[PDB]
């Protein structure tokens, strides 16, 4: 049914998530409120003009405290403390937790203490009591009453898992390592400036910046069988959007490059339809801005070293692709409310 | 013979200043303390490693509450409220205000309340009460007892004022406009994010971002004659450091391009020696990194449209160049401490 949804954190994932929604067929959700560190004028301007997505083709306006998009008005709240949000008094069923700050089971829960009945964290959930779901991987294990706080995991996990699955079912992964060449994000400083993480402290657009990641280890949360098998790192490079992951897994059933590609392609057309895209063209990162799928396998890059050491390369529009999955996950929860 | 100095805000300018100081042969200053929003470790690390300046060739160590560079130890504090800083007990004479948040005499004064005797703001003073000086333009009019709170103006003003002077003292400025193609700075967002200034909110490394500036007018503080004559705008572009000013002024005494550069060139080796550099080589921005001068005139680019319309282009390392001028100003005050 049409559950009421509120967005906490109207940033990149926040505004991207909205646009994905406003552009869908049918909907079991209804965004009624948006909490952000800004006024309604700012929230309206940024949803319309985008350096990456380009201008939002829609009717957009705003007033002293709300924004209307194609006839739909959404209230604009500006409180940094989730505990003080009008969730209860606004009959908010689901909160999209996309501030990047309340990502622990404890912090996200504050939306619940404020009245929300469920909170969806657009990032890996830290702590206990969170339900992580990767659409196309373990989303069928979704149950409304299993968790009050759920997570859509990270964008890298959303690219990694769908591919790790097909490679596991078909060849069974023994162990593996990964590296993601990611676009820089708002957690990095534009110029060398203070940061708790000395690498995130460095000028983002002029450096290749390594960062630890729990995307590899997080894959275990949706593919239990892989627990303790995958690990990796991340390298942020000078591009504003679109990333690519480099997966190297040791398989049990030796194979050849063509076989790996044949199954990935098979899945892109069957089981992983709409989640894993198969690409045999010699494209570059910017060609994937706007791609809806989560993993976009670049087949000409697939390699199999000595029958059992497989290497797959997959692109993913970390902002837009991931957002489609967040809208997907919200829909799942709407179709199964109670 | 020597004044004790404290650095408030160990950012780009705060760290460029410290390095400009260590690079000099002789000084009437002694940097003994630094306040910042970080720990000593982060401070020592960002001072030593820089994406723009390169590694700091020096012996740098640190501990829980201090950093040490080439034998000199500096206490590391982290109080955002200036009124709580131990300036009085640490016998601090001069405070470099480079946090970018205390630009009014009122705010800067908080350091005086804390016990500091003088504060030098590394930015245009906001409101009344502060004395503005630009080395080589009005540094001769410096009186120790005039203002407890001084200002080295903005980086653009430091490149503009010195050129406008020579242009006024030789051709007499009737008026003019100015555009500065500036490198992006820490007040801009790496990606489209919320900001009180809708343009500064846009992804800095992928956009040409216009912003209102005061630099044009600020010249009137060091050159009263030009009061209300100059004006300008700013265009921030995708480079991490080094900017260039485009000055177009209607001269009173009709001349020719060769003369204008003849004048400027003369100053570079005489009056404005050390302040203005005269370049007649086909160079580009990166070539000017680490340039000590405040204004670097690109002669081959000077234009004189119809005898009375002059157009000058001057480069400047907004961080390093400006910081040499801050060291200069600090040194002046040291040599005239009352």
């Amino acid at each position: 049914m049409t559950i009421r949804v509120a967005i906490n954190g109207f940033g990149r994932i926040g505004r991207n998530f909205l646009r994905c929604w406003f552009g869908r067929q049918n909907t079991d959700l209804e965004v009624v409120a948006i909490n952000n560190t800004s006024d309604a004028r700012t929230a309206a301007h940024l949803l319309e003009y985008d350096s990456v997505l380009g201008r939002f083709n829609a009717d957009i306006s705003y007033d002293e405290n709300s924004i209307t998009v194609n006839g739909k008005t959404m209230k604009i709240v500006c409180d940094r403390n989730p505990l003080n949000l009008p969730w209860k008094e606004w009959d908010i069923d689901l909160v999209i937790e996309s501030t990047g700050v309340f990502v622990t089971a404890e912090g996200a829960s504050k939306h619940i203490q404020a009245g929300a009945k469920k909170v969806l964290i657009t990032a890996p959930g830290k702590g206990e009591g969170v339900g992580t779901y990767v659409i196309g991987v373990n989303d069928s294990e979704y149950r409304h009453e299993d968790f009050a706080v759920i997570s859509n995991a990270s964008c890298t996990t959303n690219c990694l898992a769908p591919v790790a699955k097909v490679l596991h079912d078909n060849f069974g992964i023994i162990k593996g390592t990964m590296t993601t060449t990611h676009s820089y994000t708002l957690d990095q400083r534009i110029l060398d400036a203070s940061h708790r993480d000395l690498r995130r402290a460095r000028a983002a657009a002029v450096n290749i910046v390594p960062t630890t990641t729990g995307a590899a280890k997080a894959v275990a949360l949706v593919i239990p069988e892989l627990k303790g098998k995958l690990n990796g790192i991340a390298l942020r490079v000078p591009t504003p959007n679109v990333s690519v992951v480099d997966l190297v897994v040791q398989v049990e059933k030796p194979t050849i490059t063509e076989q790996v590609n044949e199954v990935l392609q098979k899945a892109s057309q069957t089981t992983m339809k709409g989640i894993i895209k198969y690409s045999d063209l010699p494209l570059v990162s910017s060609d994937f801005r706007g791609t809806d799928e989560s993993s976009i396998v670049d087949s000409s890059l697939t390699l199999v070293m000595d029958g059992d050491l497989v290497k797959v390369i997959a692109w993913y529009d970390n902002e837009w692709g991931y957002s489609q999955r967040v809208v997907d996950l919200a829909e799942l929860a709407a179709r199964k409310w109670a | 013979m020597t004044i004790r100095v404290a650095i408030n805000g160990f950012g780009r300018i705060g760290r460029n200043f410290l390095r400009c100081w260590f690079g000099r042969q002789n000084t009437d200053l002694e940097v003994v303390a630094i306040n910042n929003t970080s720990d000593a470790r982060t401070a020592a690390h960002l001072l030593e490693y820089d994406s723009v300046l390169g590694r700091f060739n020096a012996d740098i160590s640190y501990d829980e509450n201090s950093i040490t560079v080439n034998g000199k130890t500096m206490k590391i504090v982290c109080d955002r409220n200036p009124l709580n800083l131990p300036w009085k007990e640490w016998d601090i004479d001069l405070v470099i205000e480079s946090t970018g948040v205390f630009v009014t005499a009122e705010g800067a004064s908080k350091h005086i309340q804390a016990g500091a005797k003088k504060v030098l703001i590394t930015a245009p003073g906001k409101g009344e009460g502060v004395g503005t000086y630009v080395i080589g333009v009005n540094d001769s009019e410096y009186r120790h007892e005039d203002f407890a709170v001084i200002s080295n103006a903005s980086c653009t003003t430091n490149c503009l004022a010195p050129v406008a002077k020579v242009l006024h003292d030789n051709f007499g400025i009737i008026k003019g406009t100015m555009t500065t193609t500036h490198s992006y700075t820490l007040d801009q967002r790496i990606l489209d994010a919320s900001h009180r200034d809708l343009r500064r909110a846009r992804a800095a490394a992928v956009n040409i971002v216009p912003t209102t500036t005061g630099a044009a007018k600020a010249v009137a503080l060091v050159i009263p004659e030009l009061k209300g004559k100059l004006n300008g705008i700013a265009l921030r572009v995708p480079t991490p450091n080094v900017s260039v000013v485009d000055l177009v002024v209607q001269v009173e005494k009709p001349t020719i391009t060769e003369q204008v550069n003849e004048v400027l060139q003369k100053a570079s080796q005489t009056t404005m020696k050390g302040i203005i550099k005269y370049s007649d080589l086909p160079l580009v921005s990166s070539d000017f990194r680490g340039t000590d001068e405040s204004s670097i005139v690109d002669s081959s680019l000077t234009l004189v449209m119809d005898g009375d319309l002059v157009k000058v282009i001057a480069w400047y390392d907004n961080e390093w160049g400006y910081s040499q001028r801050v060291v200069d100003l600090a040194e002046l005050a040291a040599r005239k401490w009352a």
Binding site: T37, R80, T99, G100, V101, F102, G107, A123, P124, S154, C155, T156, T180, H182, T185, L186, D187, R189, A193, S194, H195, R196, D197, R200, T211, T213, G214, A215, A234, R236, S243, N318 | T37, S38, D39, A40, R41, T42, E64, C78
Partner: peptide, 23 residues
């Protein structure tokens, strides 16, 4: 590695010096 960022980031989780996104 928390002689400062521990408390600071606890009290100011959205500060530029504290943001950590799991890329």
């Amino acid at each position: 590695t928390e002689p400062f960022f521990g408390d600071y980031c606890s009290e100011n989780p959205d500060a530029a010096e504290c943001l950590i996104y799991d890329d």
